[PDB]
Design an enzyme around this catalytic site. Sequence first.
Site, PDB file in Angstrom:
ATOM      1  N   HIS A   1      -6.902  -5.090   4.180  1.00 18.68           N
ATOM      2  CA  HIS A   1      -7.097  -3.728   3.695  1.00 18.68           C
ATOM      3  C   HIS A   1      -8.492  -3.703   3.092  1.00 18.68           C
ATOM      4  O   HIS A   1      -8.874  -4.632   2.373  1.00 18.68           O
ATOM      5  CB  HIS A   1      -6.093  -3.360   2.596  1.00 18.68           C
ATOM      6  CG  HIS A   1      -4.652  -3.513   2.981  1.00 18.68           C
ATOM      7  ND1 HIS A   1      -3.704  -2.562   2.669  1.00 18.68           N
ATOM      8  CD2 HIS A   1      -3.986  -4.507   3.616  1.00 18.68           C
ATOM      9  CE1 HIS A   1      -2.521  -2.957   3.104  1.00 18.68           C
ATOM     10  NE2 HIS A   1      -2.666  -4.133   3.688  1.00 18.68           N
TER      11      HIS A   1
ATOM     12  N   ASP B   1     -10.553   4.370   3.889  1.00 15.71           N
ATOM     13  CA  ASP B   1      -9.739   3.186   4.078  1.00 15.71           C
ATOM     14  C   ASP B   1      -9.934   2.673   5.493  1.00 15.71           C
ATOM     15  O   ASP B   1     -10.348   3.415   6.388  1.00 15.71           O
ATOM     16  CB  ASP B   1      -8.264   3.500   3.809  1.00 15.71           C
ATOM     17  CG  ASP B   1      -7.484   2.280   3.357  1.00 15.71           C
ATOM     18  OD1 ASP B   1      -7.414   1.299   4.129  1.00 15.71           O
ATOM     19  OD2 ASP B   1      -6.939   2.293   2.231  1.00 15.71           O
TER      20      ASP B   1
ATOM     21  N   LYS C   1      -6.990 -10.482  -3.578  1.00 18.78           N
ATOM     22  CA  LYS C   1      -7.957  -9.412  -3.336  1.00 18.78           C
ATOM     23  C   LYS C   1      -9.286  -9.635  -4.055  1.00 18.78           C
ATOM     24  O   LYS C   1      -9.341 -10.308  -5.094  1.00 18.78           O
ATOM     25  CB  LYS C   1      -7.372  -8.059  -3.763  1.00 18.78           C
ATOM     26  CG  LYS C   1      -7.012  -7.965  -5.241  1.00 18.78           C
ATOM     27  CD  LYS C   1      -6.559  -6.571  -5.642  1.00 18.78           C
ATOM     28  CE  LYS C   1      -6.104  -6.553  -7.094  1.00 18.78           C
ATOM     29  NZ  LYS C   1      -5.564  -5.226  -7.495  1.00 18.78           N
TER      30      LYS C   1
ATOM     31  N   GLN D   1      -9.212   8.425   0.957  1.00 14.36           N
ATOM     32  CA  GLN D   1      -9.932   7.152   0.843  1.00 14.36           C
ATOM     33  C   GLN D   1     -10.671   6.865   2.137  1.00 14.36           C
ATOM     34  O   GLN D   1     -10.229   7.282   3.211  1.00 14.36           O
ATOM     35  CB  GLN D   1      -8.989   5.997   0.512  1.00 14.36           C
ATOM     36  CG  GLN D   1      -8.576   5.941  -0.950  1.00 14.36           C
ATOM     37  CD  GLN D   1      -8.059   4.573  -1.366  1.00 14.36           C
ATOM     38  OE1 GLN D   1      -7.206   3.994  -0.695  1.00 14.36           O
ATOM     39  NE2 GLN D   1      -8.570   4.050  -2.480  1.00 14.36           N
TER      40      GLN D   1
ATOM     41  N   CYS E   1      -1.757   2.524   5.563  1.00 19.47           N
ATOM     42  CA  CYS E   1      -1.534   1.194   6.158  1.00 19.47           C
ATOM     43  C   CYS E   1      -0.397   1.166   7.188  1.00 19.47           C
ATOM     44  O   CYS E   1      -0.616   0.715   8.316  1.00 19.47           O
ATOM     45  CB  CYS E   1      -1.322   0.121   5.071  1.00 19.47           C
ATOM     46  SG  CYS E   1      -2.083   0.505   3.466  1.00 19.47           S
TER      47      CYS E   1
ATOM     48  N   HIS F   1      -8.463  -0.961   8.165  1.00 21.25           N
ATOM     49  CA  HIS F   1      -7.636  -2.140   8.336  1.00 21.25           C
ATOM     50  C   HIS F   1      -8.150  -3.021   9.446  1.00 21.25           C
ATOM     51  O   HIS F   1      -8.415  -2.546  10.546  1.00 21.25           O
ATOM     52  CB  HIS F   1      -6.198  -1.725   8.601  1.00 21.25           C
ATOM     53  CG  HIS F   1      -5.543  -1.122   7.408  1.00 21.25           C
ATOM     54  ND1 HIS F   1      -5.653   0.212   7.088  1.00 21.25           N
ATOM     55  CD2 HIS F   1      -4.813  -1.688   6.422  1.00 21.25           C
ATOM     56  CE1 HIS F   1      -4.999   0.449   5.968  1.00 21.25           C
ATOM     57  NE2 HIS F   1      -4.481  -0.689   5.543  1.00 21.25           N
TER      58      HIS F   1
ATOM     59  N   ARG G   1      -0.259  11.261  -4.000  1.00 24.05           N
ATOM     60  CA  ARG G   1       0.442  10.495  -5.027  1.00 24.05           C
ATOM     61  C   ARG G   1       0.914  11.473  -6.097  1.00 24.05           C
ATOM     62  O   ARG G   1       0.124  12.250  -6.630  1.00 24.05           O
ATOM     63  CB  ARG G   1      -0.461   9.391  -5.618  1.00 24.05           C
ATOM     64  CG  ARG G   1      -1.748   9.868  -6.289  1.00 24.05           C
ATOM     65  CD  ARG G   1      -2.752   8.737  -6.529  1.00 24.05           C
ATOM     66  NE  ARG G   1      -4.061   9.263  -6.951  1.00 24.05           N
ATOM     67  CZ  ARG G   1      -5.244   8.650  -6.805  1.00 24.05           C
ATOM     68  NH1 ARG G   1      -5.350   7.449  -6.232  1.00 24.05           N
ATOM     69  NH2 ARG G   1      -6.351   9.257  -7.236  1.00 24.05           N
TER      70      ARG G   1
HETATM   71 ZN   LIG Z   1      -4.116  -0.329   3.355  1.00 26.35          ZN
END
Ligand SMILES: [Zn+2]
EC number: 6.1.1.3
Lengths: 401, 400
Positions: free
Chosen positions: A270, A142, A224, A140, A93, A144, A122
């Site tokens: 997100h 992912d 979310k 991921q 992000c 945005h 992580r």
């Molecule tokens: Zn994010």
Amino acid sequence: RDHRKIGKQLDLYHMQEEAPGMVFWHNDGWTIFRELEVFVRSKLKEYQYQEVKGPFMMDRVLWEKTGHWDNYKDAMFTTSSENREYCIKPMNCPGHVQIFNQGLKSYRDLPLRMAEFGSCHRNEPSGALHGLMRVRGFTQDDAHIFCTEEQIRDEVNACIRMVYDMYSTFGFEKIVVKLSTRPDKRIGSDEMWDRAEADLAVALEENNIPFEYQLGEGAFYGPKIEFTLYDCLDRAWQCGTVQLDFSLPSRLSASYVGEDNERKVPVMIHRAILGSMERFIGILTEEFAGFFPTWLAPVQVVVMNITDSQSEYVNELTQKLQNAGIRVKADLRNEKIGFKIREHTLRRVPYMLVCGDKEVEAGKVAVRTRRGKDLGSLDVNDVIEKLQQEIRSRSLQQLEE
Amino acid sequence: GRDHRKIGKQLDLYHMQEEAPGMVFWHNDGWTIFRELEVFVRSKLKEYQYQEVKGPFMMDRVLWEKTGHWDNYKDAMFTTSSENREYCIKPMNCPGHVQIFNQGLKSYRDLPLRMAEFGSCHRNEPSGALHGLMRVRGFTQDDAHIFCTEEQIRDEVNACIRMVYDMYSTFGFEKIVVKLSTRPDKRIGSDEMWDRAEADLAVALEENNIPFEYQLGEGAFYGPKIEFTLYDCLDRAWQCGTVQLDFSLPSRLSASYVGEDNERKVPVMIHRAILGSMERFIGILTEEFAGFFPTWLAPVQVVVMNITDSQSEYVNELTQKLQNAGIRVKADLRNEKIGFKIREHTLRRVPYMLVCGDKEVEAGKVAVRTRRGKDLGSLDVNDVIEKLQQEIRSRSLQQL
Ligand SMILES: [Zn+2]
Ligand SMILES: [Zn+2]
């Protein structure tokens, strides 16, 4: 249906204690991973997403400004150089806001949709690790979305569409949905949260999607939606997230020029659909029991001969399939046709193309599946066109005969 | 006027910040170039019979001590900690590929085994030594390792050489200088071992009529290497390609295979990179072409445009047809005048710009012009898609 067992048998990956929680992808496993990326990329094109790539590490000083430092500090890998501390990214992000921050942005440029196959790390405890499901190094799917407050509803609508679109490609139809509302510790006005929660609710209701509220379980920076899919064993897998964010953009000095020529802070969304792609391959391995749909299969076709006599027919056929863009091998070993079929059935090869005299003489090929179904002799160019169509459409079904 | 830093800003390819020294943020259009370069390398991996793998971002320090690179790379590595154990962020892919080779019983029939990776690597070097994309901390090499027998060395080096010249020629690099680095003072193996290994490289180059200079004492401690240096249009030297023999790392990492006589033999490893750092190679290409990337590499290959609001529907049909043919295309249906639009995509080095007027719609044609500012006239729709497809799929350096 054990992805660790199946992963070892089919030679997809391995794990070792010198690199806990980080996958060594073998050739065939990496082929599955890459085809999964190609599929997501086709979705990114259809839904008007950019694709970017950010660096692996960033100054701790920047991570301190995100609002995530205190919550993530214990979970990040850090490393030092020239009296400066760097964090290995656990999320994409902040990096995406850095890209957004280059060049002046206008209301014209919004919604700006930015995706990445961002390898994140992580530092979880070693005892919590388990194959592909719980890993340290993960990727991921992912993305945005930077947008105005008025645009949130339409963009959540598109995310919702993209989620069910992607899940139904793999045969996941039973989806459970949770909308998490304002926590006790949070940022922003009560009416900001009213609007944001209402946008997520109305978007789900507009699409006839049933959901339950989860009271007090939203993040500090916004509410979310989470999407939980069920496999063929009826086991639950939380995968999807659409997460509104009214914190990070302002925290990292994100802005754009509005219609009224005033500086405004964009809202951030997100979204991940598959979640951890290593885990999702793990889920698919168990869903399909190693019988990956043709488009994902590491080896899609094996062409084989009955005797040495058909070897050059097999070579020509194998070259035709290479030219058609199909992942093909030729099995020209001195073994029984049954021994060749048994080995590649066990390797989970979707199609075995058998070449005997009758097939050679007619200009045809005999098609057997890994399920054991004999589809008979077919015209070579007709089999290729049908194989292409199956791959092109990403069908769950093998050919009918 | 061919600074990659300037062109990278102008075409919105990438940026770098002080918060992440020597580590690239690839924007949409820059990342498009990177991935196409990746597609190109993969087509060569298929042609030259390479597997493609992916390894972990870090491994235990205890493993890196066992490789024999620890004392040399100590200061050049990023390290991190977790549960009383030290992990090194990988500066190279060599150990990890052997770890993959160590899985499952290998025989002589499996050799030669060729294993490639677009391996994300990190080197901790002083921030003063960083220069745009040419010297970075976070880099991605087009690395590969070939596991083979002693007799197979000669043939695999030959294949590596062919692959090097093949790839450099695709980008227009024909001036290639070659260096052979020989045994240093601090080294591994007997004298007769280096006699074989140096001769293997030397004879392979001699058989290919490739002139080279000896670079005495400048090799690694575990084997000799060939280094390939290409020259851009300004006649600047860029060392990119490496072919390195290794008679140490397999033994020290317990690499073995079942030989033809049913006994454990240690294989020899050939390290090889052609482009080297792909961030740096993108840098070199940005400067070589001055932002006028060959159509196959161009972030946006075509832009379809309407003279007025009337043609809106025709542009969408033509854009879709281009998109079906596998072309990176963008419809530009803003209300800013025709010349305004042309100027903008001209300055962003979009190879082809397709204007649609009334004469073009009725005739079933399109008005094409180049980023150079050159008129190709009104041409047939389907003939333009065919021409572009050949240019793109053959990876032509030349435009129409
Ligand atoms: Zn994010
Ligand atoms: Zn290497």
